[PDB]
């Protein structure tokens, strides 16, 4: 391995953290009362995942990927069950991303970070595929 | 030595995976007739996990550690109730064990079995939860 395949995969999960958290401003948006606390578990966790992967790129001299301004949704969306259903691909799409941090971190800091946010990103999923 | 560290770090998963599909031995005559869905779930899972791990631990030149004739449970369970509890701190100390075998295992496709091992630890756990969360809390007074 290289240097340059672990932060090209860090780098990646932070573009999709970026993704996510504009995501769940529409899964907020949707989303009935009943799931607030949900969403706002959610948010916090991605915030200050997003915020810590930040610091860690710069302790490797590494320029973060910043947030677009907007995203195209990865679905259309209509519904509050739409709101769920874009919730449970986002996550899965941040595990798929952290699993890529796991195998390529050289340090086990880091393979240990990106092990705690697979695994935040899967029970994460879980909780809203109980919503639909 | 590194390799050690990681030999030690799996052997103790699979410890605990012999003494986890021992205790839901005990969650299964205890619980529900309502969750036996999730304990036959739970119980392949880690019987699936726990084979995994003699496999790998052979291809490193390791004889397994086989389980013991019986443990002490990590707490003392009377009832239904009882048991969604013993199935939470089950899965809590294999994230725990998981954990470790993430941070100490040097390949890659060690590291990615042993992140999806805790990963399904955790998911289960918050399954758990989810029945004792469920049933009535009866918190004695303090």
């Known amino acids: ?10 780098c990646d999960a932070l573009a999709v953290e970026h993704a ?11 989303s009935p ?3 607030n606390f949900l969403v706002a578990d959610a948010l916090k966790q991605h915030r200050h995942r997003r915020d810590d992967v930040i610091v860690m790129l710069s302790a490797r001299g ?5 947030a677009a ?4 949704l990865p679905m259309q969306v ?5 709101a769920a259903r874009l919730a449970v691909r986002m996550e899965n799409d941040g595990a798929t991303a952290w699993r890529a941090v796991v195998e ?4 086990a800091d880091d393979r240990v970070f990106a092990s705690t946010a697979l695994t935040e990103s899967a029970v994460m999923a879980t909780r809203w595929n109980r919503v639909l």
């Not at 391995?1 to 860090?10: I, K, P, R, V």
């Not at 996510?20 to 949707?30: D, E, H, P, Q, R």
């Open 104 to 107: 390529h971190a050289e340090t």
């Open 69 to 72: 301004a907007g995203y195209q």
């Open 1 to 10: 391995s290289e240097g340059s395949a672990d932060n090209a995969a860090l």
């Open 33 to 35: 009362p009943g799931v």
């Open 20 to 30: 996510t958290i504009y995501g769940y401003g529409i899964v907020s948006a949707l």
């Open 78 to 82: 209509s519904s509050a069950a739409d």
């Open 62 to 66: 590494v320029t973060a990927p910043i």
